[PDB]
Homo-oligomer: A and B are copies of this chain.
Amino acid sequence: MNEKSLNKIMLIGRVGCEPDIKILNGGDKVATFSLATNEFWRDRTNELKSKTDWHRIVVYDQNIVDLIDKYLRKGRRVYVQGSLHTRKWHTNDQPKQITEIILSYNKGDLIFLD
């Protein structure tokens, strides 16, 4: 028991790659894709800077995996909502981190936009 917390990330952008669908030992499927969003802003100069961010989306929700399998293609615009989680991993010699947006059973959402 830790204290209750909120951890919610909402994104709207474009799919950068063709989603990968893996099957877990047991049948359960997982889907994986990359989503681009952008910002733009003037420097503190008025010169005019831009930034694209690539978010790794990992989907465990079986119904949404299916929808991604059937319909989701590189270049599609989607809304994605989940939780933001970082994991370490080692490779036989410090650990590397990745950060992933996770869509679990009954907690995530995906809406096809375009």
Footprint of B on A, CB under 8 Å? 1-14, 26, 28, 36-41, 44, 50-55, 77, 79, 83-86, 97, 99, 104, 106-107, 109, 111-114
Query: Majority SS of interface residues in chain A?
Result: strand
Residues of B contacting A114 with CB < 8 Å? 77, 113-114
Q: Nearest 7 CB-CB pairs, A to B?
A: A6-B12, A5-B37, A2-B38, A106-B106, A5-B13, A114-B114, A99-B99
Copies of this chain? 4
Q: A105 → chain B, closest Cβ, in Å?
A: 8
Quick check: A40 and B2 within 8 Å, CB to CB? yes
Quick check: B8 and A13 within 8 Å, CB to CB? no
Q: How far is the CA of A12 from the CA of B78 in the complex (A)?
A: 12
Q: How far is the CA of A38 from the CA of B9 in the complex (A)?
A: 14
For the A-B complex with A2-B38, A4-B112 known, give 17 more contacts whose Cβ atoms are closer than 8 Å: A1-B38, A1-B50, A2-B40, A5-B36, A6-B10, A6-B12, A6-B79, A7-B11, A8-B9, A12-B111, A51-B85, A53-B84, A55-B84, A77-B114, A84-B84, A84-B99, A106-B106
